[PDB]
Amino acid sequence: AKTQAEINKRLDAYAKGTVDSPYRVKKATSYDPSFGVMEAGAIDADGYYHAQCQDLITDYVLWLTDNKVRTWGNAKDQIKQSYGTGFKIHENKPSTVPKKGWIAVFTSGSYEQWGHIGIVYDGGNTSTFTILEQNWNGYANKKPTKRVDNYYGLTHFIEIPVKA
Ligand SMILES: [Ca+2]
Ligand code: NA
Ligand SMILES: [Zn+2]
């Protein structure tokens, strides 16, 4: 398991394009004519579809679990599987406010078909929070980027284990 300080450092490194990941693009990379060229810093964990939202999560969960747990499926399928001990799935209730490093999962409305997914960067309040995500633009080309979200479509949070 990882400490909060280790988690926090890794989130900043995602956003800066310096994360210690073998799935981080070093030089602008392209293979799928439907998507934009992946900039340095993008995370592509599967070698399909350039840098999608779930690619970030695949990398993060591999790091959290010392490469023991590889996610399968699309963003929306993450709430149908378990990442193991100390990972907990929470329904997003109007009461619910997440914690830095938790995983935010969008499965309703405009996100229903594939889901969307990202990492909680700032837990915020009941109105907004800051997410760190890939592919909110649909072009699958940018590195992980921060965005303010209003909980629209957001159905679940995945709590991750934190080492004291
Ligand atoms: Ca990919
Ligand atoms: Na909420
Ligand atoms: Zn997606």
Author numbering: 2 to 165
From the paper:
The structure has the papain-type fold with a long loop between the two amino-terminal alpha-helices.
For the native structure, a calcium ion, a zinc ion and a 2-(N-morpholino)ethanesulfonic acid (MES) molecule have been modelled associated with each of the protein chains. Other ordered solvent molecules have also been modelled in the asymmetric unit and consist of one glycerol molecule, four putative sodium ions and 741 water molecules. A calcium ion was found tightly bound to the protein. It likely has a structural role, stabilizing the protein fold. Also, the occupancy appears to be less than unity, we estimate it to be around 0.67 based on refinement runs performed at different occupancies. Finally, the resulting electron density around the zinc ions is somewhat ambiguous and we could not model the ligands without some remaining uncertainty. The coordination distances for the zinc ion are not ideal; the zinc ion is too close to Cys54 and too far from the coordinating oxygen atoms. Zinc ions may play a regulatory role, and their binding near Cys54 suggests they may regulate access of the substrate to the catalytic site.
